[PDB]
């Protein structure tokens, strides 16, 4: 799982044009480089070590527990490439990990506790995973899909009439985020602007994997008094006040 | 040869015409913008018919937004897509609450077998004399020979 | 596509031969050597069916 | 897919989107599956690449859209890739097990450069050019060895 | 779990054919698919149960007992039960006891905050402004025993055991039983410094 | 008048005259000269029991067809079964029309796969009008059981897992080719085809009758469009083709004499020459020659129109009074000894081709010898093979004035740039490799040169080699297994196939997950 | 080493769909 | 075939049709090959086809009409195929 991340991290710095990660410390103090990457399960193959492979008295490495930890992927990154002493906030968001990660990563920089942040998500696919996803009847029932005459490539069909269960996948995604000011001084490429990132619980439920409409609270605004235009929206107004 | 192939569960259904209308309109919209499809083409007629067939209120609203919010000044192509657009709107407004139609607007072509200098045999479908619309097709069929 | 240098005799007016290539491929003016082409350049310096290169291209074991 | 379509629609409705301007939905999972952890990050990667190209990849696996999803005016479901003139902002929405809502808004990068001077921009461009040549070298170097 | 007495198994090889035992049709076929040539199965005509002749060269797991050396832990006192605080049985059996710890801890904290009904918060504050930033280092450990070990032993385990393995779901159950917030949720892993 | 269009000068003004209904006072029925038979015409049964041209019937038919060309035909509330509508068929072109008119259609395929699914998906996404639906089912005309199940599957209620329809039209066009099979060579193939092309179609008409009689539906007949041939064994080598196509003509008599006239109607389509696609499908070469006898050959779209002509509410009424035979043949009846004349037109083209070929062969050799290998080996140019220049796809940075147009001008020095979050670098490792490779598959659905090479390098199929490769010093790509040199051109041909199998969403490969 | 490299150089030197043949038409058979 | 209309067409009908058309063709098939084998080009066998004029005028005859009408193809295939020297066709339209 970490191997996924390491490659993803390196290639991201290459996509950022940063060949030597130490170059960051020309501009930025050691304490201002954050790693807010996270997972939903983490060291799944390490757990196969712990619960199963030990029980079978197969030879397993002593420190397999440390590879089971979710935060240690981010640690290996900092332990092999980064050498930062900056913050580290490793989120769990089983499916929405990456978004949560971005939210935090932003919030780390808006404090000024970090100026550059490594961000994104990762999870692996293993034996016990697929079976438990199977027992929650969440994944696509392949045998039923073969009965419907479907081929592998077309088994993931979002917003479809005939949609039935998802397709479990492995891999890792990494993004690098900065203060615009710093980004412009470093002469790094700029791919876009993170405008808004937020997270949202739902309500009282009795079903865990049931998604809720909570995130609507990105769009909250009051409407009893909407007869006349607000000057707060007008850039003309805001500019003059500055 | 006589082996069973049919089962109930393999049956794929297609019904979401409402969704394809917007997409096919949107595809066409940008194709004109990059200068792939021009005024003169028969594609822009045939595609229109399919959109006019699939006309409902939402599909007007969709067309009303994307056409009324172009800037004509940026490119020659942007003027063209507005002019086509405004006209295409007016048609769809009339064909609303009217049964859709099979109309074929394809160029009537004949066979031409060409033998070059080296004796290579080439076949190509060529525009005929006097038959350029299915109007003139039906007359030709009636008049015999 | 086909070559712009058909015969090597075209190089006898070398300035005009260079310009012709780099007008068709402007990217080549604004980009460092691919490491593949670096090694190919050095392998062609060792080509023995050829008067040896009158410069030093690289510092390595073979510098001597 | 029902829930996510519903919530985006209600966002667009409450904030008074012009009637006939649907948001366009890309469904990356159709091609990539569900990397449950890394879900948003790939969608993030995708969104960025969409912004810097003006290209919208359709859901090629979408043979037929659920009749239920017609009621959501402000959402559009493409199948083929849509080559546009530009994209301004992209919404990213992931839904996690155990009530884990999340929305990210990512904005076209050229909007940033507006807020600075000619001088700092021209200074920036020269150093990015310096990055690009240096980056190209190291990557292809590190690749082949 | 007695740390002086740790259940573990060794992969061994059968030297001589075993004596038949009874099992269901389904069960027998599961053996046959595993071992193939190294097992035979037969319909016992009267019952409709199947005999299982496990043969020479087959693979077996025999339990054995490791004598382990860390016998002491800081343990929540004997007789502690989620029952006594007010948690109902339907909730207990469904959920990893790690959550039970949290739920009690959460309630008692609101009591320490003087908030008896958590809904009281919404007199002052909008639904979107109540966050749960609680977290773990490992999380649903007992759920993982479900997944990796207890399934493998074909012991009856609840289907949705995976959702109790997730670290964030403890915080979710809090919001799913008490809070009803639509505010943020940021669940950190910091194994020791969580 | 001859109606003036705006077609192939300005298609903004023939987009303007599509909803406009054209009412014409002089019908094309009166345009029909006496002593002359039109190309398209209906036929009427004589007391003798043969099929003569009828003026009156044909008139009504062509009038409907004239109206189809101008205002068009609706297929709303028409339930259609169709078979043999494969890619590049008349069937498919008929299907297009039905969907364009808003018909609800069941299409039957043989080679049910991904490629075929996507094809019919493409069609409904382009032509499918409002109220139109399309159903694709895998189907074997040959199988009795499949026929009985399919008809049941259409008419059974949605609640028992059916369609709950009632068909208005049946087009049983499905059939197979028989080539070089004369009387003596008649065997398995022949009988099976005949079972498809006659028996099961009867059984299909059989099946629909029973299911309609069951529910007491006496007043909604389905119109069966019989594919007729006029060339009932004029050609030979067609095996049991003729026998099948002639046997269908029994339906024109059984409709009168049996008790199924209220549940089905017969509309026999005598199909003429239709040119296929725009390549040398063996018969397109001689089409031109045949038209110089005052014959007319048809395009796929033209013949489709003609068949869609048979579903116009006027001829719908005729089917429901009398059997309707439709001579949709451009006078191939009237060319005598059609086999011999065919083969003559092949000959005169082959002959003319062969002589001009053999001259071209000698004028190459009688130019070779003269010029040796000095004006035939110095004529060859130098071709350049492309190689992989993988780019990092950094954002194109426009000049300053091409940024200030975009953002409003007031924004300058307004924002704190220490409180703006910017994505600086991104990457992924996925079932489609890197972010670059994934994007190409996501957006384009096929790898570029750069794509393939990167993917092959990732998947350990190629690796770079510098130094001594079997003595000869080599610089370039090398197959990771065979240690054979590879160039970027070949990568597509050698690896892509292998890459698409073992990349992305696929069957679980136990090697990657420890068995 | 040159002797080794010279040495190793000298050890090399049914379709019922009418998609293929359109036999609904009288012409497609062979005619 | 008695009391078998279109809907009631089944096993019986197809088998009879196999007798009344297919095998007769195959029989004419068989004789051609065996005559062409021995190089007998000048001794054709005369096939007396039982014809009906009532091609489905009656109904309830199942696949009788279809068989009896399909035989009329032989009057055209005799011209257009290479078996004219080994067989000849003599269609007998039989009355009451």
CATH code of F75's domain = 3.40.50.720
Chain E: residue nearest D99 by CA?
E172
The C-alpha atoms of residue A44 and residue A132 are separated, in whole angstroms, by 13
With CA atoms as reference, report the closest residue to B8 among D130, F106, D55. F106
The C-alpha atoms of residue D99 and residue A211 are separated, in whole angstroms, by 6
| Long-range CB contacts (within 8 A, 24+) of F482-487 | F486/F462, F487/F385, F487/F387
Residue A64 CB neighbour total at 10 angstroms: 17
Tokens representing residue E126 in the block: 């909008």
Q: Which CA distances in Å does F447 have to A156, F16, F388?
A: 21, 42, 12
- Using CB atoms and an 8 Å cut-off, which of residues 151-170 of chain A contact chain D? 153-154, 156-163, 166-170
Cβ-based neighbours of D16, under 8 Å, separated by 6 or more: none
Q: Residue F79 — φ and ψ, nearest 5°?
A: -95, 120
Q: Do A93 and E168 touch (CB under 8 A)?
A: yes
Q: Residue F51 pairs with which residues in a beta bridge?
A: F45
Tell me the chain F residues in contact with residue C3 when contact means C-beta distances shorter than 8 Å: 381-384
Q: Residue D100 pairs with which residues in a beta bridge?
A: D96
Q: Do D137 and C36 touch (CB under 8 A)?
A: no
The C-alpha atoms of residue F125 and residue G26 are separated, in whole angstroms, by 32
With CA atoms as reference, report the closest residue to A68 among A10, A18, A126, A22. A126
Residue with token string 């062409």: H36
Q: Rg of chain E over CA atoms, in angstroms?
A: 24
Tokens representing residue F54 in the block: 């009828």
Please check whether residue D111 touches F, CB under 8 A: yes
Cβ-based neighbours of H24, under 8 Å, separated by 6 or more: H71
The C-alpha atoms of residue A26 and residue A15 are separated, in whole angstroms, by 19
Q: Which CA distances in Å does D35 have to A122, A159, D2, D40, F190?
A: 7, 18, 20, 9, 54
The C-alpha atoms of residue F115 and residue F299 are separated, in whole angstroms, by 25
E strands, chain D, in order? 23-24, 55-56, 75-76, 82-83, 89-96, 100-107
- The helix (run of H) or strand (run of E) holding residue F264 is strand F264-271
Residue F332 backbone zone (phi > 0: left; psi -120 to 50: alpha; other: beta): alpha
With CA atoms as reference, report the closest residue to F269 among F315, F326, F308. F326
The C-alpha atoms of residue H62 and residue F94 are separated, in whole angstroms, by 32
For residues A94 and D36, the answer to whether their CB atoms sit within 8 Å is yes
A117 in catalytic set: no
Q: Residue F61 — φ and ψ, nearest 5°?
A: -60, -55
- The helix (run of H) or strand (run of E) holding residue A97 is helix A97-111
The C-alpha atoms of residue B24 and residue B44 are separated, in whole angstroms, by 11
Tokens representing residue F14 in the block: 């023939």
Cβ-based neighbours of F503, under 8 Å, separated by 6 or more: F431, F432, F433, F455, F459
Q: Do F249 and H55 touch (CB under 8 A)?
A: yes
The pairing of beta strand E59-66 with beta strand E187-189: unpaired
Q: Do A174 and F428 touch (CB under 8 A)?
A: yes
The C-alpha atoms of residue F469 and residue A163 are separated, in whole angstroms, by 53
For residues F461 and F441, the answer to whether their CB atoms sit within 8 Å is no
The C-alpha atoms of residue A122 and residue A39 are separated, in whole angstroms, by 5
Tokens representing residue B94 in the block: 């009339």
- The helix (run of H) or strand (run of E) holding residue C35 is helix C35-45
With b for 16 or more beta-carbon neighbours within 10 A and e for fewer, the A22-31 pattern comes to: eebeebbeee
For residues F290 and F297, the answer to whether their CB atoms sit within 8 Å is yes
Helices (H), D27-117: 29-32, 39-51, 110-113
What DSSP string runs through A220-238? Answer: ----SS-SS--TTT-HHHH
Tell me the chain D residues in contact with residue B62 when contact means C-beta distances shorter than 8 Å: 20, 22
Neighbours of A (≥3 Cβ pairs closer than 8 A)? B, D, E, F
Say which DSSP state E15 is in. S
Please check whether residue G2 touches F, CB under 8 A: no
With CA atoms as reference, report the closest residue to F140 among F202, F207, F193, F188. F193
Q: Do F424 and A110 touch (CB under 8 A)?
A: no
The two most distant CA atoms of chain G are separated, in Å, by 75
Neighbours of G (≥3 Cβ pairs closer than 8 A)? F
Say which DSSP state F67 is in. H
Cβ-based neighbours of F58, under 8 Å, separated by 6 or more: F32, F38, F40, F41, F42
Q: Which CA distances in Å does F162 have to B9, F135, F154, F157, F158?
A: 10, 12, 6, 5, 5
For residues F137 and B10, the answer to whether their CB atoms sit within 8 Å is yes
Separation of CA B103 from chain center: 10
Separation of CA F225 from chain center: 19
Tokens representing residue F328 in the block: 């949709």
What DSSP string runs through E89-144? Answer: HHHHHHS-HHHHHHHHHHHHHHHHTT-SSGGGGGGTS-GGG--B---BSS--HHHH
For residues E164 and E140, the answer to whether their CB atoms sit within 8 Å is yes
Residue H65 CB neighbour total at 10 angstroms: 24
With b for 16 or more beta-carbon neighbours within 10 A and e for fewer, the A90-108 pattern comes to: bbbbbbbbbbbbbbbbbbb
For residues A125 and A51, the answer to whether their CB atoms sit within 8 Å is no
Which of A98, A190, A218 faces D11 most closely, judged by CB atoms?
Answer: A218
Residue with token string 């006309």: B55
Tell me the chain F residues in contact with residue G9 when contact means C-beta distances shorter than 8 Å: 470-472
Helices (H), F249-405: 251-257, 284-291, 300-309, 313-319, 338-371, 401-404
Please check whether residue D97 touches A, CB under 8 A: yes
Separation of CA B108 from chain center: 15
Identify the burial level of F358 via C-beta atoms within 10 angstroms of its C-beta, where 0-12 means exposed, 13-18 middle and 19 or more buried: exposed
- C-alpha angle with apex F369: F364 to F370, nearest 5 degrees? 100
For residues E142 and E165, the answer to whether their CB atoms sit within 8 Å is no
Between chain B and chain D, are at least 3 CB pairs below 8 A? yes
First to last CA, chain F: 79
With CA atoms as reference, report the closest residue to F289 among H75, E78, G15, B115. B115
Strand order in the sheet with A192-200: A33-35, A116-123, A171-179, F421-429, A192-200, D100-107, D89-96
The two most distant CA atoms of chain B are separated, in Å, by 65
The C-alpha atoms of residue E103 and residue E115 are separated, in whole angstroms, by 15
The pairing of beta strand E22-23 with beta strand B109-115: unpaired
Tell me the chain A residues in contact with residue B7 when contact means C-beta distances shorter than 8 Å: 147, 149
- C-alpha angle with apex F241: F237 to F245, nearest 5 degrees? 145
Coil/strand/helix, residue F17 = coil
Instruction: Give the gap in angstroms from C-alpha G18 to the nearest C-alpha of chain F.
Output: 6
Alpha-carbon torsion angle F476, F479, F480, F484, nearest 10: -90
Helix F300-309 with B134-143: angle, nearest 10 deg: 70
Which of C1, C3, C36 faces F475 most closely, judged by CB atoms?
Answer: C36
Tell me the chain D residues in contact with residue E169 when contact means C-beta distances shorter than 8 Å: 97-98
Please check whether residue D96 touches E, CB under 8 A: yes
Tokens representing residue F313 in the block: 């509410």
Residue with token string 């119109």: F223
Identify the burial level of F26 via C-beta atoms within 10 angstroms of its C-beta, where 0-12 means exposed, 13-18 middle and 19 or more buried: exposed
Instruction: Give the gap in angstroms from C-alpha A205 to the nearest C-alpha of chain F.
Output: 32
With CA atoms as reference, report the closest residue to C47 among D70, D25, F472, A48. F472
Helices (H), A82-205: 97-111, 127-135, 142-147, 180-186
Q: Do G17 and F109 touch (CB under 8 A)?
A: yes
Q: Residue A206 — φ and ψ, nearest 5°?
A: -125, 15
With b for 16 or more beta-carbon neighbours within 10 A and e for fewer, the G10-19 pattern comes to: eeeeeebbbb
Chain D: residue nearest E183 by CA?
D101
The pairing of beta strand F79-83 with beta strand F104-109: parallel
E strands, A129-232, in order? 171-179, 192-200
Between chain D and chain C, are at least 3 CB pairs below 8 A? yes
Tell me the chain A residues in contact with residue F426 when contact means C-beta distances shorter than 8 Å: 12, 15, 120, 173-176, 191
Identify the burial level of E154 via C-beta atoms within 10 angstroms of its C-beta, where 0-12 means exposed, 13-18 middle and 19 or more buried: exposed
First to last CA, chain H: 18
- The helix (run of H) or strand (run of E) holding residue F203 is helix F200-214
F252: domain range?
Answer: 1-380
Chain D: residue nearest A213 by CA?
D7
Q: Do A161 and B7 touch (CB under 8 A)?
A: no
Handedness of CA E17, E23, E29, E31 (dihedral sign): negative
The C-alpha atoms of residue F31 and residue B136 are separated, in whole angstroms, by 12
Instruction: Give the gap in angstroms from C-alpha B66 to the nearest C-alpha of chain D.
Output: 7
- C-alpha angle with apex E49: E43 to E54, nearest 5 degrees? 70
What DSSP string runs through B99-144? Answer: ---B---PPPEEEEEEE-TT--EEEEEEE-SS-SSHHHHHHHHHH-
The pairing of beta strand A116-123 with beta strand A33-35: parallel
Tell me the chain A residues in contact with residue F136 when contact means C-beta distances shorter than 8 Å: none
What DSSP string runs through A24-69? Answer: GGGTS-GGGEEE--BBSS--HHHHIIIIIITTTT----TTHHHHHS
Breaks in chain F listed by the residue before each, with C–N > 2.5 Å:
none
The C-alpha atoms of residue A32 and residue A25 are separated, in whole angstroms, by 9
Tokens representing residue D140 in the block: 């292809």
With CA atoms as reference, report the closest residue to B42 among A48, F307, F497, F6. F6
Q: Residue A172 pairs with which residues in a beta bridge?
A: A122, F429
The C-alpha atoms of residue B124 and residue B122 are separated, in whole angstroms, by 7
For residues F248 and F205, the answer to whether their CB atoms sit within 8 Å is no
Q: Which of A7, A30, A95, A138 is catalytic?
A: A95
Tokens representing residue A231 in the block: 């000057």
The C-alpha atoms of residue F376 and residue B85 are separated, in whole angstroms, by 57
What was the elucidation method? X-ray
Residue A225 CB neighbour total at 10 angstroms: 7
Residue with token string 């007391």: F47
With CA atoms as reference, report the closest residue to F390 among F477, F466, F485. F477
Cβ-based neighbours of F448, under 8 Å, separated by 6 or more: F440
Residue E127 CB neighbour total at 10 angstroms: 18
Tokens representing residue D24 in the block: 């366009």
The C-alpha atoms of residue F238 and residue F376 are separated, in whole angstroms, by 48
Chain F: residue nearest C40 by CA?
F475
For residues H66 and F198, the answer to whether their CB atoms sit within 8 Å is yes
Instruction: Give the gap in angstroms from C-alpha D131 to the nearest C-alpha of chain C.
Output: 11
Which of F28, F117, F153 faces B142 most closely, judged by CB atoms?
Answer: F28
Cβ-based neighbours of F59, under 8 Å, separated by 6 or more: F27, F29, F32
The C-alpha atoms of residue E90 and residue A81 are separated, in whole angstroms, by 49
D-interface mutation test, from A97, A107, A167, A226, most D Cβ less than 10 A away: A97
Please check whether residue D23 touches B, CB under 8 A: no
For residues B33 and B78, the answer to whether their CB atoms sit within 8 Å is yes
With b for 16 or more beta-carbon neighbours within 10 A and e for fewer, the B17-36 pattern comes to: bbbbbbbbbbbbbbbbbeee
The C-alpha atoms of residue H45 and residue E41 are separated, in whole angstroms, by 67
Tokens representing residue D105 in the block: 């808004």
For residues B105 and B134, the answer to whether their CB atoms sit within 8 Å is yes
Handedness of CA D1, D6, D12, D15 (dihedral sign): negative
Question: How many residues belong to chain G?
Answer: 31
Separation of CA E36 from chain center: 32
Separation of CA F449 from chain center: 31
Handedness of CA B81, B82, B84, B90 (dihedral sign): positive
Separation of CA H50 from chain center: 8
Q: Residue F105 pairs with which residues in a beta bridge?
A: F80, F134
Residue B2 CB neighbour total at 10 angstroms: 13
Tokens representing residue E55 in the block: 């043969």
Which of A7, A178, A184 faces F429 most closely, judged by CB atoms?
Answer: A7
The C-alpha atoms of residue F234 and residue E26 are separated, in whole angstroms, by 64
**Residue ranges of chain B whose CB lies within 8 Å of a chain A CB:** 7, 9-10, 12-13, 15-16
Choices 2.20.140.10, 3.40.50.12780, 3.30.67.10, 3.30.70.2490: CATH for E2-68? 3.30.70.2490
With CA atoms as reference, report the closest residue to E20 among E47, E55, E45. E55
Q: Do A149 and B7 touch (CB under 8 A)?
A: yes
For residues D101 and A195, the answer to whether their CB atoms sit within 8 Å is no
What DSSP string runs through F396-452? Answer: P---THHHHTTS-GGGTTTS-GGG-EEEEEEEEEBTTBSHHHHHHHHHTSS--HHHH
Which of B14, B19, B65 faces D77 most closely, judged by CB atoms?
Answer: B19
Identify the burial level of E142 via C-beta atoms within 10 angstroms of its C-beta, where 0-12 means exposed, 13-18 middle and 19 or more buried: middle
Q: Rg of chain G over CA atoms, in angstroms?
A: 31
Tell me the chain D residues in contact with residue A123 when contact means C-beta distances shorter than 8 Å: 35-38
Coil/strand/helix, residue H87 = strand
First to last CA, chain B: 45
Please check whether residue H58 touches F, CB under 8 A: yes
Say which DSSP state A217 is in. G
């Amino acid at each position: 799982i970490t191997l996924f991340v390491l490659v993803s991290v390196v290639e991201a710095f290459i996509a950022s044009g940063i060949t030597d990660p130490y170059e960051m410390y020309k501009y930025v103090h050691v304490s201002e480089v954050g790693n807010c990457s996270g997972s939903g399960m983490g060291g799944v193959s390490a757990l196969r070590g712990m619960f199963k492979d030990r029980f079978k008295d197969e030879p397993v490495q002593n420190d397999i527990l440390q590879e089971s930890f979710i935060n240690t992927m981010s640690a290996w990154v900092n332990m092999l490439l980064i050498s930062s002493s900056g913050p580290i906030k490793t989120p769990v968001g089983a499916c929405a990990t990456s978004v949560e990660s971005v939210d935090i990563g932003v919030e780390t920089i808006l404090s000024g506790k970090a100026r550059i942040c490594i961000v994104g998500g990762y999870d692996d696919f293993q034996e016990e995973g697929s079976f438990e996803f199977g027992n929650m009847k969440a994944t696509s029932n392949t045998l039923e899909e073969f009965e419907h005459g479907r081929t592998p490539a077309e088994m993931s069909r979002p917003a479809t009439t005939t949609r039935n269960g998802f397709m479990e996948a492995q891999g890792a995604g990494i993004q690098i985020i900065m203060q615009a000011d710093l980004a412009l001084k470093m002469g790094v490429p700029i791919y876009g602007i993170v405008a808004m990132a937020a997270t949202a619980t739902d309500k009282i439920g009795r079903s865990v994997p049931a998604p809720g409409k909570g995130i609507l609270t990105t769009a909250r605004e009051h409407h009893s008094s909407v007869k006349y235009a607000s000057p707060n929206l007008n850039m003309k107004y805001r500019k003059r006040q500055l | 040869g006589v082996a069973t192939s049919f089962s109930r569960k393999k049956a794929r259904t297609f019904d979401s015409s409402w969704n394809w209308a917007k997409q096919s309109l949107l595809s066409l919209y940008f194709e004109i913008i990059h200068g792939v499809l021009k005024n003169v083409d028969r594609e822009v007629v045939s595609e229109a018919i399919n959109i006019m067939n699939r006309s409902n209120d939402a599909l007007i609203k969709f067309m009303e937004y994307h056409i009324s919010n172009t800037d004509e000044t940026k490119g020659e192509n942007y003027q063209l897509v507005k002019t086509l657009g405004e006209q295409l709107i007016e048609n769809c407004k009339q064909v609303l609450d009217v049964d859709p139609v099979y109309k074929d607007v394809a160029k009537p072509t004949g066979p031409k077998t060409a033998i070059d200098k080296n004796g290579n045999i080439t076949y190509s479908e060529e525009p005929r004399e006097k038959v350029r619309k299915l109007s003139q097709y039906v007359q030709e069929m009636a008049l015999g020979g | 596509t086909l070559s712009l240098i058909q015969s090597y005799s075209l190089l006898d007016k070398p300035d005009e031969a260079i310009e012709k290539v780099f007008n068709a491929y402007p990217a080549a003016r604004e980009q460092f050597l691919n490491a593949q082409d670096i090694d190919h350049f050095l392998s062609m310096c060792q080509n023995p069916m050829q008067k040896p290169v009158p410069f030093v291209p690289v510092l390595d074991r073979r510098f001597e | 897919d029902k829930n996510e379509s519903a919530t985006i629609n209600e966002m667009m409705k409450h904030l008074g989107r012009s009637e006939g301007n649907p948001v366009i939905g890309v469904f990356q999972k159709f091609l990539t599956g569900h990397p449950k952890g890394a879900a948003g990050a790939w969608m993030m990667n995708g969104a960025l690449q969409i912004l810097n190209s003006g290209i919208i990849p359709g859901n090629r696996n979408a043979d037929n859209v659920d009749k239920i999803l017609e009621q959501f005016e402000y959402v559009l479901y493409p199948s083929k890739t849509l080559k546009t003139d530009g994209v301004r902002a992209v919404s990213i929405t992931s839904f996690g097990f155990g009530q884990k809502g999340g929305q990210a808004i990512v904005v076209h990068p050229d909007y940033l450069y507006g807020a600075i001077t000619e001088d700092r921009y021209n200074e920036y461009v020269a150093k990015v050019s310096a990055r690009e040549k240096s980056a190209y070298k190291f990557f292809h170097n590190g690749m082949i060895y | 779990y007695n740390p002086e007495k740790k259940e573990m198994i060794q992969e061994v090889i059968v030297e001589e054919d075993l004596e038949p035992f009874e099992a269901s049709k389904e069960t027998a076929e599961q053996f046959k698919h595993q071992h193939g040539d190294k097992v035979d199965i037969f319909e016992i005509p009267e019952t409709g149960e199947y005999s299982v002749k496990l043969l020479k060269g087959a693979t077996l797991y025999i339990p054995k007992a490791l004598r382990f050396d860390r016998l002491v832990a800081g343990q929540i006192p004997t007789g502690w039960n989620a029952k006594t605080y007010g948690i109902s049985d339907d909730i207990i059996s469904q959920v990893d006891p790690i959550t039970l710890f949290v739920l009690v801890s959460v309630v008692e904290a609101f009591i320490a905050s003087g908030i008896t009904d958590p809904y009281e918060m919404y007199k002052y504050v909008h639904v979107s402004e109540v966050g749960n930033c609680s977290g773990s280092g490992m999380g649903g450990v007992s759920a993982l025993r479900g997944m990796f070990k207890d399934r493998f032993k074909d012991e009856p385990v609840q289907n949705d055991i995976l959702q109790e393995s997730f670290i964030n779901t403890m915080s979710a159950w809090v919001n799913m039983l008490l809070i009803s917030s639509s505010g943020p949720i940021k669940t950190p892993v910091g194994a020791c410094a969580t | 008048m001859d109606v003036e269009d705006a077609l192939d000068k300005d298609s903004t003004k023939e987009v303007a005259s599509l909803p406009n209904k054209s009412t014409i006072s002089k019908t094309v029925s009166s345009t029909i000269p006496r002593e002359t038979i039109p190309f398209l015409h209906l036929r009427k049964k004589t007391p003798a029991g043969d099929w003569k041209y009828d003026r009156q019937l044909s008139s009504l038919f062509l009038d409907g067809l004239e109206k189809a060309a101008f205002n068009g035909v609706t297929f709303k509330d028409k339930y259609v079964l169709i078979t043999g509508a494969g890619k590049g068929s008349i069937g498919a072109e008929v299907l297009q029309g039905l969907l364009q008119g808003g018909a609800k259609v069941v299409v039957t395929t043989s080679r049910f796969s991904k490629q075929v699914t996507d094809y019919y998906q493409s069609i409904y996404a382009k032509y499918g009008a409002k109220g139109s639906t399309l159903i694709v089912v895998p189907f074997n005309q040959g199988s009795k059981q499949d026929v009985e199940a399919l008809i049941e599957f259409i008419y059974d209620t949605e609640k028992n897992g059916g369609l709950g329809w009632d068909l208005d039209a049946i087009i049983p066009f499905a059939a197979i080719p028989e080539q070089g099979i004369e009387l003596e060579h008649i065997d398995s193939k022949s009988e099976f085809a005949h079972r498809i092309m006659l028996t099961n179609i009867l059984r299909m008409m059989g099946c629909v009758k029973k299911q309609k009689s069951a529910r007491g539906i006496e007043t909604r007949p389905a119109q069966v469009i019989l594919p007729m041939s006029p060339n009932h064994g004029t050609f030979g080598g067609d095996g049991m083709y003729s026998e099948s196509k002639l046997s269908l003509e029994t339906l024109f008599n059984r409709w009168h004499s049996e008790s199924w006239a209220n549940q089905l109607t017969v509309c026999g389509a005598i199909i003429g020459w239709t040119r296929g696609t725009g390549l040398m499908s063996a018969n397109n070469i001689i089409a031109e020659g045949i038209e110089k006898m005052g014959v007319r050959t048809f395009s796929q779209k033209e013949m489709a129109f003609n068949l869609l002509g048979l579903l116009t509410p006027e001829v719908v009424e005729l089917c429901q009074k009398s059997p309707v035979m439709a001579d949709l043949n451009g006078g191939l009846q009237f060319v005598p000894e059609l086999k011999e004349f065919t083969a003559k037109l092949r000959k005169e083209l082959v002959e003319t081709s062969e002589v001009r070929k053999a001259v071209s062969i000698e004028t190459a050799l009688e130019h070779k010898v003269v010029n040796g290998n000095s004006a035939d080996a110095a004529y060859a140019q130098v071709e350049i093979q492309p190689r992989a220049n993988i780019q990092l796809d950094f954002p194109e940075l426009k000049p300053y004035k091409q940024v200030k147009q975009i953002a409003p001008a007031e924004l300058e020095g307004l924002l704190d740039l220490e409180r703006v979050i910017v994505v600086t670098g991104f990457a992924e490792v996925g079932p489609w490799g890197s972010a670059r490779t994934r994007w190409e598959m996501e957006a384009f659905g096929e790898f570029s040169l750069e794509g393939c090479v990167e993917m092959a390098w990732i998947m350990g199929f190629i690796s770079y080699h510098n130094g001594n490769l079997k003595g000869r010093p080599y610089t370039g790509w090398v197959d990771s297994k065979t240690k054979e040199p590879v160039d970027d051109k070949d990568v597509k041909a050698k690896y892509e196939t292998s890459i698409l199998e073992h990349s992305g969403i696929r069957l679980i490969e136990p090697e990657l997950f420890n068995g | 080493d040159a002797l080794e490299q010279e040495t190793v150089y000298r050890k090399t030197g049914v379709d019922m769909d009418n998609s293929n043949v359109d036999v609904v038409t009288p012409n497609s058979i062979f005619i």
